[PDB]
Known about the structure:
The complex is a heterotrimer. Helix content of chain A is 6%, strand content 44%. By secondary structure, chain A is mainly beta. Chain A has a 4-stranded antiparallel β-sheet, with no helix packed on it. Chain A has a 4-stranded antiparallel β-sheet with strand order 6-5-4-9, with no helix packed on it. In chain A, a hairpin with a 2-residue loop joins strand 13 (145-150) and strand 14 (153-155). In chain B, strands 2, 3, 4, 7, 9 and 10 form a 6-stranded antiparallel β-sheet that branches. In chain B, strands 11, 12, 14, 15 and 16 form a 5-stranded antiparallel β-sheet that branches. In chain B, strands 1-6-5 form a 3-stranded antiparallel β-sheet, with no helix packed on it. Chain C is mainly alpha-helical. A two-stranded antiparallel sheet of chain C has the order 2-3. In chain C, strand 2 (144-146) and strand 3 (149-151) form a beta hairpin. Chain C is globular, with a radius of gyration of 21 Å. In chain C, 24% of the residues are buried. The interface between A and B is large, with 52 and 42 residues. Strand 8 of chain B pairs antiparallel with strand 1 of chain C, so a sheet runs across the interface. Ligand GJ9 is lined by residues 61, 64-65, 69, 85-86, 89-90, 93, 140, 169, 173-174, 218, 254, 257-258 of chain C. One cholesterol binds at residues 94, 97-98, 101, 121, 125, 172, 176 of chain C.
Amino acid sequence: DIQMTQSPSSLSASVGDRVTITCRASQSVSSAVAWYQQKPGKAPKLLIYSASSLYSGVPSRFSGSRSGTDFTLTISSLQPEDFATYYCQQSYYYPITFGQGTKVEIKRTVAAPSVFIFPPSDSQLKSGTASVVCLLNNFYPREAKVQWKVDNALQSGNSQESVTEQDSKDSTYSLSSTLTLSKADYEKHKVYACEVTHQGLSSPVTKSFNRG
Amino acid sequence: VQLVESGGGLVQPGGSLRLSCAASGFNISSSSIHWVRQAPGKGLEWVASISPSYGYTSYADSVKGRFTISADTSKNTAYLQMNSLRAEDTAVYYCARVSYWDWTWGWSKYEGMDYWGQGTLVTVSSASTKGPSVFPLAPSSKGTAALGCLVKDYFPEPVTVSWNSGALTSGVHTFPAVLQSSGLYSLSSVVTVPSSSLGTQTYICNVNHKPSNTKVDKKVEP
Amino acid sequence: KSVLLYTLSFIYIFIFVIGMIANSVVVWVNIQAKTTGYDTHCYILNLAIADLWVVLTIPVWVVSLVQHNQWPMGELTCKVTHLIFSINLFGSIFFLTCMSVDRYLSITYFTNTPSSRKKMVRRVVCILVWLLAFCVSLPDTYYLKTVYCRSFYPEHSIKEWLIGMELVSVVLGFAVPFSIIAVFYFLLARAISASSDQEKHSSRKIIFSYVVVFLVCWLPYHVAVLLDIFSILHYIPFTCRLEHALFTALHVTQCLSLVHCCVNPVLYSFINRNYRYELMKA
Ligand SMILES: Cc1cc2cccnc2c(N2CCC[N@@H+](Cc3csc(N4CCC(O)CC4)n3)CC2)c1OCCCC(=O)O
Ligand SMILES: CC(C)CCC[C@@H](C)[C@H]1CC[C@H]2[C@@H]3CC=C4C[C@@H](O)CC[C@]4(C)[C@H]3CC[C@]12C
Ligand SMILES: CC(C)CCC[C@@H](C)[C@H]1CC[C@H]2[C@@H]3CC=C4C[C@@H](O)CC[C@]4(C)[C@H]3CC[C@]12C
């Protein structure tokens, strides 16, 4: 297997800006590279094939080059319809190996995250499993740190994090962290807390609630 | 070129399946057919490839000795048969064509996959169908409160959640499903509304599950 | 008679110029294209090199012919030229043979083979063909001397040697190459006919030319040579008219044969749209 590293892992460029994505191989592959474009939940399309040729149909903005074993895809103006991951393929040596991909996302100004805490309904206590939710709403950028510390006792290893995609209008994300315990374990503890640290927050925000 | 896949569906671990990519608009025998796989929320990967003419098939490491790729030129079709599937095979499979052109035999270029079919989800999960359990994420004690519905322990995907009979569509978020350790999905859908409005207009969330046609109208309220 | 020799000299000069220019251009484009992401073919480059060498050697033949069949140069030039010409000609013919089978396999067998493996296979085939051409050509120059530059075969069985050599030139020189090329281009035409997409892009009136130019080039020469050999065997009566007719036929058909050198670039690369676009770019 030929390992193909790709950078940068994640981009952030506003409409009209240039873009450059680099693909580094391991051995030497002679011009047998290609670049695709997978829109969210759709079959990838072929953007560039061979070292630098353009597949008939794509706009002239997309272009490729080559330098030894390092390949590069350059976009002059980043149209609003060009925001989707791009993958790097090599065909010289089987098995074919793809790249990690370089997601391209909208850019905007920093925005603080609205933090909320939701306890578990008394009805759910009957099931015996209690879950608490910490919600970060309408923030930017993707990076965000959320941690749980029940009565200052840090908890780790049991939590689920889920984020949405760039909002259509505001171009902002939204994150939910769920902490799951056992009914007896939840009843044993006194108070719960959620701490959020973010680029748009000067200091971490700690939102806490008591079991009663 | 109108490649189309088929097959796919929930399979018990260790079972077997046969996906079929049936081409059209060209003769399959003059181009190689590859199978590409995409894990949920991850990058693409290569699986196998076949030349229908004389059948020179090359497989990927993770599928060596397990996946068999065959071709039928009498119908312009390719078949990938998989057995002993593990939990890590959950993915979406596409079939791609590595176009070859003869009119440039002397001075050619390193071709690449150009025509891809649609996906065919292959969920290798030992779980079974189940109905979602809806729980109210009630508003906090104390200017815009937030409230939501948490649907837990449901299978398989998907689920559609609409708030207040579709009356509310601004400020409502439904996060993507996360596969719990136990093997049953969970999903939270939360909306933010003015604090004053609370206690006057009752908020209800609709959870509909086609696989078990289960409909729940949960009344979230502090 | 001298009129015929002067006309043949003019034709040879024209062929030399055209072949030199065309082969040089083809080799240059083939070398330069690899930097533009193309995948050029080894056989085309080797064929161009062989044609270039034959064209480079033509002038010695022209000078010898114009000098009333005299041989002013020494034996060293005799041997060197009669070796280089033969090696390059056999190499060109063998590459024309191998190229057809490679082209046919490209559409069925090599459809799903990584570029590295097919590149290695092509390099191996090229080396094998060069070695085989040199091995087949060596014996002819092994016994070539000047005293009139010609071949002085062993006396004890000299007769046999003559026909011996001739057989090779018709068995491994023209018979098998034509058989293989015709068979495999017919198979390729049938395979294209079976498919539908390939019909629009490609044309079926080029393969027929590929397989017919070989005859138009190498059939008259071989038939003339066989007639000469049969005459040397006294099967045909000895007459002034017959010997003159044989001489004229041999000279004219030899002049026609070297058209095979300058018609390869125009038939295998020039008509290619990608090659034309690349050349215009360069
Ligand atoms: C100008 C010229 C062209 C020739 C073209 C073809 C053959 N010969 C030519 C020739 N001569 C005559 C024949 C011997 N021939 C040796 C030879 C080794 S392998 C070979 N091929 C035979 C056909 C087969 O298909 C491939 C291999 N031919 C070279 C010397 C020429 O110079 C004329 C000499 C002056 C004179 O005519 O008085
Ligand atoms: C005594 C000589 C001049 C006659 C013997 C034939 C000569 C012309 C032959 C012998 C070996 C041949 C070389 C063998 C291999 C290659 C590699 C190929 O990728 C380019 C051509 C090249 C470099 C050939 C050029 C022609 C060559 C040098
Ligand atoms: C000039 C005449 C008399 C001899 C011509 C023989 C040529 C056509 C023969 C010599 C060696 C042969 C090759 C030997 C090995 C392989 C590898 C195989 O995986 C595909 C066929 C291929 C590539 C053969 C094609 C035909 C070949 C090139």
